[PDB]
Amino acid sequence: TTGIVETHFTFKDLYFKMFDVGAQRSERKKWIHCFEGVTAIIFCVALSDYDLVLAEDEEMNRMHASMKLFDSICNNKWFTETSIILFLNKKDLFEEKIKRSPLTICYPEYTGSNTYEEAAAYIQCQFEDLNRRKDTKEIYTHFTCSTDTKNVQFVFDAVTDVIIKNNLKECGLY
């Protein structure tokens, strides 16, 4: 059935629990305060979606919608001290499609070449600059893929950093 999906896994003696709420097709301003006390918010953004367009509007890049959703959930009144772990996915499809089409299709003021690195850093910067609260929260960004287990390692390290910094703030030492 639909609803929130709950996932458990143990990694280096830590029991990670994750809650997928993509099945919730309703107003998010009525249940998002339930997740007020979460260690981190893992946000997935597909890099290969700059060329694509959402069929609902036919003039709406899915990357712009991802940016809107990320900004909405980042600067929420409840997540004022919660860290966000960004996952820029499908780096390979981006690698070929940037060779085919420039990133100017999505952002009209890109002003750059068609190499993977410039566009990747550009999308990362455009996402991270949407963090208006640059004092009490941090964004950790990855590029995933690699068909490996480095993703859980990155999540573990980022969660450990979040926990340590939370303790430091609670002590006043940060």
């Binding site: 640059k134 980022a158 450990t160 340590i164 910094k165 430091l168 940060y174």
Partner: peptide
């Protein structure tokens, strides 16, 4: 004294971001 040297001269190191970046560099 060292810390004073940081606070008055070279005051561009007096940032939350640098401190958090180093504490991340601890075990990340």
């Amino acid at each position: 004294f060292n810390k004073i040297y940081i606070i008055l001269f070279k005051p561009s190191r007096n940032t939350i971001e640098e401190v958090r970046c180093s504490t991340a560099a601890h075990a990340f």
